Each structure stands twice: as C-alpha cells, then as structure tokens.
Amino acid sequence: MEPTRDCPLFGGAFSAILPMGAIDVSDLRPVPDNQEVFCHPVTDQSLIVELLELQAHVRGEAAARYHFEDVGGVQGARAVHVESVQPLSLENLALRGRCQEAWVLSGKQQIAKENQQVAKDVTLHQALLRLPQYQTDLLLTFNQPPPDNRSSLGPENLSPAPWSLGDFEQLVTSLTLHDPNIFGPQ
Incomplete structure (x- = not known):
C-alpha cells in the first residue's frame, strides 16, 4: 500500500506528503513557517x-556540495566522505508541476564534540531543489x-522496520504544487 496525505502549507501554496508518524517539532521549539522540522x-x-x-548561481550538484560545506563545515564535522549522488529529474516530481532541476547528495561526517575525542557517524541524506518562481533553493535534511x-x-x-530511500523520495515529492496561491502578490 502506498498512501499519501498532502498537508496544507503557506495557506495551500505547497502540498507536503507524510502519513502518520511524522510530527513537527515546532510544538517543542519556535520554527519559522519558512522551514519545517518533522x-x-x-x-x-x-x-x-x-x-x-x-x-x-549555485544550483544542482554544485548547490549540494556548496551548501554541504556550510553545514558539515561551519558546524563541527571534521571527516566527511562521499558515497554517491542521485540526479532528480522532472519525472521525480509526483505532481510534476514546474521544477527547473533537482539533485541528491548522500554522505557522513565526523562531528566531534568539545572534547574532540569522541566521534559519531550520522547518515545525512540531503536533496537540493531549485525553482525559478523567484530564484529559490529548498534544502532537505535526513x-x-x-x-x-x-x-x-x-x-x-x-x-x-528501518526506513529507506522510499521515504526520502516521498519527502522530496512533498512539494507538490496544486494551487499556485504563492505566485501573485502573495
């Protein structure tokens, strides 16, 4: 079974898919509408x-690495390797509205603590998405x-059981554009 529930975003401009289990941590801490932490x-x-x-002009595969260094470089992480990258074409867009391009960069870094002795590998699955609506760059973190x-x-x-790419792919499609409420003066 492959269900789907588009949750209203920004008044209905973006449709995010994510069945039960995925809860927003906004109730635990302040989080601007511009972002979403489930x-x-x-x-x-x-x-x-x-x-x-x-x-x-940083977009696509370049956008991933560029932003990656800002995340795994500005906040700890001393040893990071690259496993591979999956290019996200227009077909990847479930609703398949209007998407200029999309890419995926997976990997892990060595985030050391104040002690600089302890280490922990955390699988980071990020997806770089760019839309020409107004030169935007949506960042995903798994x-x-x-x-x-x-x-x-x-x-x-x-x-x-442990979630796989199946869930990640669904999260990327969580930007289905049905009603362009954020196109005019909005």
Whole structure:
C-alpha cells in the first residue's frame, strides 16, 4: 500500500506528503513557517526542510556540495566522505508541476564534540531543489543511522522496520504544487 496525505502549507501554496508518524517539532521549539522540522518516534528519525534564495548561481550538484560545506563545515564535522549522488529529474516530481532541476547528495561526517575525542557517524541524506518562481533553493535534511550493524542485524519479526530511500523520495515529492496561491502578490 502506498498512501499519501498532502498537508496544507503557506495557506495551500505547497502540498507536503507524510502519513502518520511524522510530527513537527515546532510544538517543542519556535520554527519559522519558512522551514519545517518533522520527526518520527517509531524510527527516531529527523526530517528538516528549510527555504533559501538562489545565491549567485549555485544550483544542482554544485548547490549540494556548496551548501554541504556550510553545514558539515561551519558546524563541527571534521571527516566527511562521499558515497554517491542521485540526479532528480522532472519525472521525480509526483505532481510534476514546474521544477527547473533537482539533485541528491548522500554522505557522513565526523562531528566531534568539545572534547574532540569522541566521534559519531550520522547518515545525512540531503536533496537540493531549485525553482525559478523567484530564484529559490529548498534544502532537505535526513538523519539516519549508518549501515554497519555488527552481530545484531536488527529485529526480524518484531517492531517497525528501518526506513529507506522510499521515504526520502516521498519527502522530496512533498512539494507538490496544486494551487499556485504563492505566485501573485502573495
């Protein structure tokens, strides 16, 4: 079964898909409408969506690395590698409204603490999206545990299973444009 629930955003300008389980942390802390931070208790995952403006001319694969260095470079993270990148074409847009382009860059960094002795690898799945509506750059952030479960391979016939790209792909499609309420004077 592949359900879908478009949640009203900005009065109905953007439609975000994400069934039960994904709750906004805005109730726990202040979060401007420009961005959205959802979380899943079942898998203990984290989903963040922040809106940005096209700076100079950094978009696509370049936008990913450019913004990556600003995230994994300005805030800790001393050792970061690159696993691969998946190009997001127009077909990737569920509603398939109007999308100039889209790219995906996955990887992990070594975020050291004040002690600079401890280390923890966190799988970061980000997707760079750019729209010509007004030179925008939507950033996506996915936090998941790195694939290296030794000895125990996780529950087999008990508790929920770990989310995969299937969920990430759905989050990217969470920007379906049905009613262009944010096109005119809005």
